[PDB]
Amino acid sequence: GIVEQXCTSIXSLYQLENYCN
Amino acid sequence: NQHLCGSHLVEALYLVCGERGFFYTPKT
Numbered sequence: 001g002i003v004e005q006x007c008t009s010i011x012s013l014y015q016l017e018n019y020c021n
Numbered sequence: 022n023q024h025l026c027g028s029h030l031v032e033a034l035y036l037v038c039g040e041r042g043f044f045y046t047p048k049t
Contacts, residue, residue: 001045001046002030002045002046003026003030006024006025006026006030007024007025007026007027007030008024009024010022010023010024011025013037016025016033016034016037017037017038018047018048018049019034019038019043019044019045019046019047020034020037020038020039020041020042020043020044021038021041021042021043021044021048
């Protein structure tokens with residue numbers, strides 16, 4: 001999930017915004 | 022460049038998602 005995408009790998013602001021409600 | 026981990030991740034979600042909150046996986 002997000003730990004893989006943002007912490008282990010690199011995530012952009014665009015990907016982070018995909019988690020917003 | 023940098024990885025987003027720990028408290029930094031949760032705080033970034035506060036700003037990016039604002040008062041709406043967030044999910045553990047994308048809603049689409």
